[PDB]
């Protein structure tokens, strides 16, 4: 079966690491950080990796029941699955699907419904992926809210991510850190079944990132979010499951108003994109541009300069 990539443009697509639209393409030099995300990881033949699932609205969300923590405004959530069934902390995944893959503080809203009378309550809440109480692989996390007396027990509760927050008396832009993985089992275990780290295996080649801007909710946060594959390509590769004729597919970026090729890049079977460039570059593209698969190539194909 012939391999293809969707003909959607960058503005039409969605980030695979947070439920927000894409914005621009960006290439930058890897080094001083390890590119090892667990969302947006998917092979070209349809195999999902890490914490990747298919719905773009279930990224960075949580479901389950809550419990008030004595004398605080904090709540502990016992995690369920997406379909509200029980979560199995013995599944061969790093954490429940859609769980964040970066260290930071995520602000959103906790909502709850009482199955009895159909009454509802919602409160702003914050979750910090970098503290001791963030143990999603164990099924339990913590929320900081504004109320100490409104969320009931044994009821379905859902966390909906909105943005990121930075708390501090200075130290600006020190969080979130998109290339630092959380400890999915807290201080009581090492992460397991992770998606492999990715890096170009070719000097002068850099990764191409699909970049969106996360909303900020408090302070001076880092709102840039790079992903390896748009959520739409993750969905495409899964449905098509076209076998790879090689370890590297060659894509071309086309401006259909002219018919002209703007640049070419390598789509690696493992599920990420490389360009031939040196230094950080915010790519400037026509809004109609789309990627196009041309041919499968070998290990030693040399790319035209982006």
């Amino acid at each position, epitope marked *: 079966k012939p391999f293809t990539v969707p003909i959607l443009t960058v503005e039409e697509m969605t980030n695979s690491r947070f439920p927000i639209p894409l914005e621009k393409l960006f290439t930058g*030099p890897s080094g001083a950080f390890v590119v090892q995300p667990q969302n947006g990881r998917c092979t070209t033949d349809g195999v999902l990796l890490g914490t990747t699932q298919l719905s773009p609205v279930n990224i960075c969300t949580f479901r389950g029941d809550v419990t008030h923590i004595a004398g605080t405004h904090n709540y502990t959530m016992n995690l369920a699955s997406q379909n509200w069934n029980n979560y199995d902390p013995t599944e061969e995944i790093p954490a429940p699907l859609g769980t964040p893959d970066f260290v930071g503080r995520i602000q959103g809203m906790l909502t709850q419904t009482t199955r009895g009378d159909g009454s509802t309550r919602g409160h702003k809440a914050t979750v910090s992926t970098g503290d001791v109480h963030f143990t999603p692989k164990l099924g339990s996390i913590q929320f900081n809210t504004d109320t100490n007396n409104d969320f009931e027990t044994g009821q379905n509760t859902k966390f909906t991510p909105v943005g990121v927050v930075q708390d501090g008396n200075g130290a600006h832009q020190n969080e979130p850190q998109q290339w630092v993985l959380p400890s999915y089992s807290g201080r009581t275990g090492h992460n397991v079944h992770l998606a492999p780290a990715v890096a170009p295996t070719f000097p002068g080649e850099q990764l191409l990132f699909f970049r969106s801007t996360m909303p900020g909710c408090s302070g001076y946060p880092n709102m*840039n979010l790079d992903c390896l594959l748009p959520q739409e390509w993750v969905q495409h590769f899964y449905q098509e499951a076209a076998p790879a004729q090689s370890d590297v597919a060659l894509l071309r970026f086309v401006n259909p108003d002219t018919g002209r090729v703007l640049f070419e890049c390598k789509l690696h079977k493992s599920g990420y994109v490389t360009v031939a460039h040196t230094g950080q570059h915010d790519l400037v593209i026509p809004p109609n541009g789309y990627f196009r698969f041309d041919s499968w190539v070998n290990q030693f194909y040399t790319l035209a300069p982006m």
Partner: antibody
Amino acid sequence: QVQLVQSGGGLVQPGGSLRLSCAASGFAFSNHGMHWVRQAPGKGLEWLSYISGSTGAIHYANSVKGRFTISRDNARNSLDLQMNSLGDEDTAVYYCARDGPRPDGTGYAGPSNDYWGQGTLVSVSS
Amino acid sequence: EIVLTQSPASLSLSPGERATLSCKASRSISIYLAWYQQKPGQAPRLLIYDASYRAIGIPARFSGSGSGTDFTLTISNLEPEDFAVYYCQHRSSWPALTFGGGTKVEIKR
């Protein structure tokens, strides 16, 4: 209350060796890469060396490769520059500058050094 | 490596006037160009990062613009303290830093 305080330098006879040091306080040291930069008197800045916070990535300018050695001890919040086989081309003020404010783990690989050292003069005269 | 030329090397302006410094790059470096200020005897001071974002604690009289190759630092109303030397800097050859030749802002009398 972020601070970079340098030590070392001084006078050296042509051919000799020196050791520079930068002591850091007020931030997560292993989260930021550090540079060494020199400014000969009256001229412009010149990049010398870089070492990254956690990845142990090390890079040197072409003029100093083989002669200089950069190093950091993240446990003691220190940064060292071993300078061997100096000459008068190496007479300058030497600065340690951090990559900031955004940590390495944010992927930012652009030009931004928000906190430097105070300066440490190195003179190579006989 | 990519080269950064500032021009001119010297500027003479009256306090209160408006300073316009230029940095030009040999080829494109997108928006990743930072401006520094150096008063003599001191270490450099970061004014502008990403070509147009003021660093933290910088007065609004400093404005940066540009992209690709042609970049411009602008001081709206020159104060007596803003007479120093000004370096542009890029980092396209990661990790190395490359600076410009500097531009000196002299007091005009």
